[PDB]
């Protein structure tokens, strides 16, 4: 049971806290969704290999450029998150998070994850974005960003419906094993 470390990075409303909570609980928080995530060690068996995957969040550190890098030591896989209902959080991926993740974590695989994919069919989300001369992030836009930033892969999920969530963490484990 090899031990590996996962760190999730991204803007404030990219849904990274919800994703970790939903993965670490599995049984959906119907009564109360917590504000913060402390840490978690998941037992994952992917492709017949057993791994202890430590999960960390960078929420609350987005404005503190000297505190934030203390999350990176010994990271084996990076989940680079953006929200599908926020095209601006996607344009901050190559400009802000990638130069920083590659500086502190060279050779560490990066998986680009488009969170909140359920909001593509949300008429209120489409209406709000249309007011700002915008549309929800298209799948090919996510794939094009992941190609341009040199990501190990592009994945989509929905913390609300749990759709795509297990597959993101199983693939992150596989990426962390590669050496």
């Amino acid at each position: 049971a090899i031990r590996k470390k996962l760190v999730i990075v991204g803007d404030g409303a990219c849904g990274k806290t919800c994703l970790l909570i939903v993965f670490s609980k599995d049984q959906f928080p119907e009564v109360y969704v917590p504000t913060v995530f402390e840490n978690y060690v998941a037992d994952i068996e992917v492709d017949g290999k057993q791994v202890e995957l430590a999960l960390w969040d960078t929420a609350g550190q987005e404005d503190y450029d000297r505190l934030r890098p203390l999350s990176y030591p010994d990271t084996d896989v990076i989940l680079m998150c953006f929200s599908i209902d926020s095209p601006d959080s996607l344009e901050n991926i190559p400009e802000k998070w990638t130069p920083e993740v590659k500086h502190f974590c060279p050779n560490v695989p990066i998986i680009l994850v488009g969170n909140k994919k359920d909001l593509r069919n949300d008429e209120h989300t489409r209406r709000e974005l249309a007011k700002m001369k915008q549309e929800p992030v298209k799948p090919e836009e996510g794939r094009d960003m992941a190609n341009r930033i040199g990501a190990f892969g592009y994945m989509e999920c929905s913390a609300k419906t749990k759709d795509g969530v297990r597959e993101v963490f199983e693939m992150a484990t596989r990426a962390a094993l590669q050496a």
Binding site: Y32, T35, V36, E38, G60, Y64, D65
Partner: protein, 235 residues
Amino acid sequence: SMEMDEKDFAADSWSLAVDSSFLQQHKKEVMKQQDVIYELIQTELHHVRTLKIMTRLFRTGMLEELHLEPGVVQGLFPCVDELSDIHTRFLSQLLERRRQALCPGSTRNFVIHRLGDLLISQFSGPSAEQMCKTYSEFCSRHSKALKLYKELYARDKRFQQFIRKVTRPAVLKRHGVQECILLVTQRITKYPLLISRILQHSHGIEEERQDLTTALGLVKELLSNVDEGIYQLEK
């Protein structure tokens, strides 16, 4: 941690911690606020418990079982006694505010109407200065503690044996040496998240919305000061 407190904070929320017929007597907006207040205290309990694992189990254990020089242990657990004192006093004030709020004949049913005053005292004056200086110190020695751990574990069999031994219980799965050090560094950046979500549901009593707005600003000023005072030391 103590059994009395663990039970009081075992539930996933305030709405689940209190008796069902007590919850039923409150307005939804109160339940929403109380859930976030309960989370702030619950995470402060885990924060203090992490610091006690670092001091009693890891730090004292090494001194009483290994022939490590005290300078090495100081490098592994920087500012832990001082951090333990700050957060144990803060937790004591939070736990007392909850107990004062309990209904007679109950050890579970409570509503905390005032929190901002307690949050202003903690994050202002001498108490805030002590946290700013202790966290700027801790976070500057953070990397050097991880490298000292990795070096000692990969070179000393007696240290490896000690670490495998003390971390064997299931309750310490996410609480190894490096994990404790990162849990502590990340704690201060959780407060603005919790205080803003509590503030979001405290607009009913204007004296409280202002107290919480003041506390929110005090924490951001503290974080900005800790962040400015950081500069990575090396072994």
